[PDB]
Design a protein around this nucleic acid. Structure first.
Ligand SMILES: [Mg+2]
Ligand SMILES: [Mg+2]
Ligand SMILES: [Mg+2]
Ligand SMILES: [Mg+2]
Ligand SMILES: [Mg+2]
Ligand SMILES: [Mg+2]
Ligand SMILES: [Mg+2]
Ligand SMILES: [Mg+2]
Ligand SMILES: [Mg+2]
Ligand SMILES: [Mg+2]
Lengths: 322, 321, 322, 332
DNA sequence: CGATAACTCGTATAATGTATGCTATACGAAGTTATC
DNA sequence: GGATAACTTCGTATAGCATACATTATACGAAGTTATC
DNA sequence: CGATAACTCGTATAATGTATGCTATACGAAGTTATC
DNA sequence: GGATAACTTCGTATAGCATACATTATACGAAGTTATC
């Protein structure tokens, strides 16, 4: 059809209207669906429902996570909708099998994992331990963790902070201005405030690394073995290096991790969000305020991040033990 | 013609639904089918005109709006999953429900909820079974414990097993919980019993002797004599656990009125509620109260305490100073 | 057309789906329309753009209110849309004229009126004025007012209150349960609790009136010229009668109403709400709490109900004068 | 008026609608018309320079133009304004609007993103808080100058009543009255909104009253109850009352600009917007003072006649009053 | 018995929520006009 | 006649506010309607 | 010249709201089955 | 033998929970890259 190839060209042309992380996965799912269809004698586009259902079952068999499957089906549906054609998920066949694959895998014992918390207590421990060091790297990584736990900002967002995005409240408390977050991309954005002590942690890093030289320099950068920061304004610290700062800081207090081959054996990127999420909940912060804090709107993930007390525990325990 | 194929693909994957869902699906189709072939109308595919009628009837029977929505809603899942236009899509039908709902809301059709099995009630019932030795008595009280101390759903208790209860450094029982029918559980995974409650549970573990085997389901059956008959292939029905509640209430306030009202004596959620309410009187943050019982729809929790004095509103405050 | 006649009929068939007041109007409007149409040689259905424009323009000449004119144009719309036909507001000619009539009228002065406030100050008076009187109606009325101010409930809603709808807090206050309002119409409803002082006033009228002998009795009933309630379960006190209670308690304190024809010349159905909002506003109650107080979900209207303190006024003046 | 609906291009019922639109021009604020005509003018000129039919706008053409407004370095809110007027002009004349098409909808999206990442952000009025009024008032309260007396009065009323400038230029003598307390009370009639969420009446402090009063004594505006409160003052220091011509909002913005230059001196050099007070500073400022003073949002919002808290929240976002829960914990 | 207190009709008009389309402001520069 | 203070008008770049939409309620003078007086 | 600290890339999977479509409880009552 | 105690299995009436949708982001082990030591 003419309309289809035109609708597609429209998209690929203005592909930058999408997250660079959406294109990465679109191509990914496609090249995988590309295979199976060739190695199974199938027309890969437009997708025929019975084949998509077969492809979804193949994925289940491969031992992939419920959510990983939801995405493969997910992108296939996009490529189609954005085309003009109907989605594979518009056919009972495809639709149902998905739910099925979901229902099955849950009972089978599969559940959605989640980052390991880095709570107040941890931040409190990693501070007194590296608080004195004079190493640049050490000075930096502390301010990073400081902001990560104090703002619940995602690593992607921290990595994008520019020195010119920093100002201060009348009281001497720093204020980082965040532009585009995961679920908001506008000219207004929001202002995230740091605690009176973290702002110190950051100040010490701002100076010891001379990034304040050009206000276009990104707050966080690299520090080579000689212990010298490489402030930049075109190259931001990669989110991998930031996920690094956690895994390291964790090793620093618990050494080499398990041999399991499982995720979240050590603090990762999302660790401070869920951590502070808990700490707040535990201190009795209200729903609307725990919201404001994380940039959330609903209450789910928050609830997903809880399981608070185990040993003595509280809530009911504390209550029954009148 | 092609609905034949669709229903195939439909049944070809029936696990795409909970047994409980499938049941009502059938159950409703039956009611539909009947009324249809008595007023003489093709039952499937159903013309929006007949459904309009059908629904109007469920109303005459006196069914609750929630129930009627369940019926109409059930017809839909049948059509959508058969490649047909769902009746909820036609002007006729969607105009009746709006008529019925309002019509019924004005008549006073009011939705109700479980009876609050609160704290003062876990005590009374407690002391009056705290000094008894009937194994069956022990069990029941050792369930009216867990339930209140975990805000666990009944079906969730039925599936707990002696491969789970673990100990605490301080002497508390933790209860791992797996195979939860929830992908993204915004609820717990490890609830811990209190001293008192742990106590009562321990006692039951021995007298019922379920420890013998791990895969053994904690709570089980007890015949008319007083012998716990553990198993690991069948669990103490929810209907049964429901009763443990039912009975315990009878033993204190007597029997139910003859007026067929619902929720006239503790039920499964009777623990949840009271549980919630008590925390609320204690000052537990709404979020804390929600992870205690594993909620996410805070309006629900806001319903189980809607009538405490702590949540009476701001105008009351102003009128008292 | 034919398909139209059907739709029209299905719409009248289940006309119970829409509120009574919606119908009383559709008619009141088609009447006034057709009337104008007959005399001005124009059709009446479908309504023609220019016809509807000259019509809306006519209603403006008669000197009707902007909000009034939007109601005719409005009902007129519901008719056509509801019967599968395009809306006269879907044509540039109509939608532009309606916009115009608003500005032209707003510029000339005409603004919307609003209920006259019946604030806390007034309540305390009305009470310390009838607080004693052992008179039946004098009892009832000071009760209705107590509830009116305390719950901000509209009146039509206070009407439908059945005795089997009252309950209590383990602390002593009443919990009137409301099932259907203006914004919502459900089986879950909400609960409005009264103060100890008002819960008391209500109690006194419950006993002295006799409505209590049957639960399905409407909390408020009439009081015949002698001084005896008329408890029912099939007859609500008319809303008009309730506006009246207000109308008179005002006459009781400020005498005759200055014959001027103007509206809101003395308390009425809403006097209590705007009042309650205002009193809360002055006390510093939060937005989310003023909302719950009146079953509102937007700070608007509450804002409209405010133009607070007169004369000395304050806020920005209290600030400057320190 | 409009650029040139083509003898050929323009045709049939779009000439009908376009006709029906100017018929009820009163349906739009004069300001809206100024922006509609400005965008057309601007698009029409981009079209001639690049050889494109300016109406009806083909999508691929609206897209080249949007990417063009981006490169010119225009702000996203401006680019959407342009897109919006082009969309009105079309729909409000019976044709399919751009952005109602796939191409224009994706560029707009791509442009908004690419832009939010260049680090573009909305700006906002430089605050004129209480301490600035105190400083400005302690320097101009000693002048017998007729212009200096007028301005100190305008600032006082602007900071105290939080009225927009357009509104202040409308206040006419007959609107001022005296409150029992010996202070004034200005009434603001004829708004624009059917429902004015601000306040019919605004009261001034005693201090601000002495300021406004002293301007009335020297300007002789009371000579007629229909004169506007504020007016010109020529080269020679003589006020010039009138009841037919108010001050331009342009000059009221000129009072804020000047008063800021008197205290901090000559402006800057960058083309930076908001380097000195403007006609919206007294509001932003007064809002902040109020917040710092522990006033409730509803009471603040009413003070300034606001209805979407998102704004007053945007004005008091950098206060310590609004720092958040995570800080409170870390600091206990 | 008739006069009264105390309560159905019809037209006019407010209320209810909010994304965004309309409506302000910002500000350099050009054009006016009464005064130095 | 010039130059100039102090505006007014303009036009284009942006910030900010309030309305269309689909009903659902109230406001209020008049009639009409019953039990008491 | 290496060795080493400190930092693209591809597949796999979590995160974002929430209205309403599933899911699970209620409960009378009819089948079960080892005890009394 | 017959009569239960204490449960199951059932079907229909109601309550309450969690997911589909369309992207957008993080996890992390491996391979590649660059100043320093
Ligand atoms: Mg999907
Ligand atoms: Mg303008
Ligand atoms: Mg300042
Ligand atoms: Mg000027
Ligand atoms: Mg000046
Ligand atoms: Mg300054
Ligand atoms: Mg609405
Ligand atoms: Mg000049
Ligand atoms: Mg994959
Ligand atoms: Mg979403």
């Amino acid at each position: 059809s003419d309309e289809v190839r035109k609708n597609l060209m429209d998209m690929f042309r203005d592909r930058q209207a999408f997250s660079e992380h959406t294109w990465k996965m679109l191509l990914s799912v496609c090249r995988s669906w590309a295979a199976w269809c060739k190695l199974n004698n199938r027309k890969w586009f437009p997708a025929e429902p019975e084949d998509v259902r077969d492809y979804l079952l193949y994925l289940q068999a491969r031992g992939l996570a419920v959510k990983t499957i939801q995405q493969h089906l997910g992108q296939l549906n996009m490529l189609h909708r954005r085309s003009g054609l109907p989605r594979p998920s518009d056919s009972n066949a495809v639709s149902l099998v998905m739910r099925r694959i979901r229902k099955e895998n849950v009972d089978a014992g599969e559940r959605a994992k989640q980052a390991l918390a880095f709570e107040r207590t941890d931040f409190d421990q990693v501070r007194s331990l590296m608080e004195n060091s004079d190493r640049c790297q050490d000075i930096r990584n502390l301010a990073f963790l400081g902001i990560a736990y104090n703002t619940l900002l995602r690593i992607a967002e921290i990595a994008r902070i520019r020195v010119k995005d920093i100002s201060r409240t009348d009281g001497g408390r720093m204020l980082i201005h965040i532009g585009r977050t995961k679920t908001l991309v506008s000219t207004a954005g929001v202002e995230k405030a740091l605690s009176l002590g973290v702002t110190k942690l950051v100040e010490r890093w701002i100076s010891v690394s001379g990034v304040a030289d050009d206000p276009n320099n990104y707050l966080f950068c690299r520090v080579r073995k000689n212990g010298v920061a490489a402030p930049s304004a075109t190259s931001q610290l990669s989110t991998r290096a930031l996920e690094g700062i956690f895994e390291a800081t964790h090793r620093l207090i618990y050494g080499a991790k398990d041999d399991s081959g499982q995720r979240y054996l050590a603090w990762s990127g999302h660790s401070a969000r869920v951590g502070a999420a808990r700490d707040m909940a535990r201190a009795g912060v209200s729903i609307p305020e725990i919201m404001q804090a994380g940039g959330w709107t609903n209450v789910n993930i928050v609830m997903n991040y809880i399981r608070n007390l185990d040993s003595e525990t509280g809530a009911m325990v504390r209550l029954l033990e009148d």
